[PDB]
């Protein structure tokens, strides 16, 4: 492996855990969180099925925790997210919000451009620019991603750059206030979940079925953006993993919670 | 065999295997495809039975995986295939499209004309035109042929050139993005529709019936390109539901894995 992961793990300041200080900033402006997902999938440029488990989750969290949320997305994922009966942001500007969230979406290069892994050019209405106006505005932003290319990862770019194939030309510049690197974006969101759970005492993932929203985003055309099976999944990983990791932290916050 | 098969297999580059990056590149454009067969056989410049059947079998997968397929091709050919309800290309235009596809049509050669392997020269309108265009508009092309002198061997023209009988004159200049060389052309486009399969999860060659397909256009005109009862490049109907078996049965046996 060469990816992103393995090297931000070994030379990220260690004085927190990976997540600890997304988790901080998360609870700390649950005010009105807007949450960014969304990545199109070259050279359909079809949105995946990572990113948008992860977003409703997060979103799920917010509520649970007495906050209101709102999703800027795709029309495709907007569609797939219909059943949940997710708030679909319109217009949404910056200043809104208390806090701006991107799970797994493209961010621009240096060259102004978005791209894949594969360095094939993504062709869609970017969504990353509210994220620069927050910046700008001093407005809390997290980001989650799992390549290099995504929304947050301009706070790591020297790394892409150095680790990753066609890190100069599709290491994204664009940076979050607290990013949240993982193998599957959706795991990193929901670990996040699993951390301001412990944290609150709650658990905000009771109830989370990961087979059926991957397969619900799947049967109205969200696809893998790793593999071409037609089969429900996530980032080439088959369902039973994800079901498995999700079991993981369901159980490790239900230990902790009931200490 | 003097041929081109033998040379490809052997020098092509290996980083994939053979059939990968057109399985690739069909799976990534589904959308409206354009496939293009027939190929005049001279002196009597009827269509032969190498390339109808491929043809039939991507445009039945292109359908199943959702996606739009569209048959240009010469007029015995369309009769031929007309009992199999597949859509016919009208006028078409390359923008219309996200892929074409050549399925063993004949290709221009360095002189501007189209010749037989044996060198004898087709007479028959072009049918190759389109694929030119489509290179210079940078829509995805992919061609499938045994003999050089297809739409899509001017990816390998050096190649030809050298090693096949003819080669200067009858290698065909005509490129294509991705090109499948197979000792039978129908082959090569099953093995695509396979590889498809085992991708997708889905055995796309399910109900295939080689014996009929080949049965039927035979018996309604096409004939056999190289010998000349119903066959293909002069090898038994038998040999063709062989191979056909072959890729069924590796293929269900990779997605129920």
């Known amino acids: 492996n060469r990816g992103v992961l393995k090297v931000y793990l070994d030379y990220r300041r260690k004085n927190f855990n990976f997540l600890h200080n997304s988790t901080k900033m998360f609870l700390d402006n649950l005010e009105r969180v807007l949450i960014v997902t969304g990545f199109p999938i070259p050279p359909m440029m079809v949105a995946e099925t990572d990113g948008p488990p992860?977003?409703?989750?997060?979103?799920?969290?917010?509520?649970?925790?007495?906050?209101?949320?709102?999703?800027?997305?795709?029309?495709?994922?907007?569609?797939?997210?219909?059943?949940?009966?997710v708030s679909l942001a319109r217009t949404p500007e910056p200043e809104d919000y208390s806090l701006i969230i991107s799970v797994?979406?493209?961010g621009r290069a240096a060259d102004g451009r978005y791209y894949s892994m594969s360095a094939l050019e993504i062709k869609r209405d970017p969504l990353d620019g509210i994220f620069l106006k927050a910046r700008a505005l001093g407005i809390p932003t997290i980001g989650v991603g799992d390549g290099?290319?995504?929304?947050?990862?301009?706070?790591?770019?020297?790394?892409?750059?150095?680790?990753?194939?066609?890190?100069?030309?599709?290491?994204?510049?664009?940076?979050?206030?607290?990013?949240?690197?993982?193998?599957?974006?959706?795991?990193?969101?929901?670990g996040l979940v699993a951390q301001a759970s412990i944290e609150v005492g709650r658990n905000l993932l009771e109830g989370w079925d990961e087979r059926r929203v991957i397969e619900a985003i799947s049967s109205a055309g969200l696809i893998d953006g790793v593999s071409k099976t037609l089969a429900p999944s996530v980032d080439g990983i088959r369902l039973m993993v994800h079901e498995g990791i999700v079991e993981l932290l369901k159980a490790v916050v239900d230990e902790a919670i009931k200490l």
């Open 148 to 190: 290099g290319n995504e929304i947050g990862m301009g706070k790591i770019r020297e790394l892409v750059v150095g680790h990753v194939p066609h890190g100069e030309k599709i290491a994204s510049v664009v940076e979050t206030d607290e990013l949240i690197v993982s193998a599957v974006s959706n795991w990193g969101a929901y």
């Open 54 to 85: 992860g977003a409703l989750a997060i979103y799920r969290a917010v509520e649970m925790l007495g906050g209101k949320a709102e999703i800027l997305t795709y029309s495709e994922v907007e569609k797939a997210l219909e059943p949940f009966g």
């Open 104 to 106: 797994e979406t493209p």
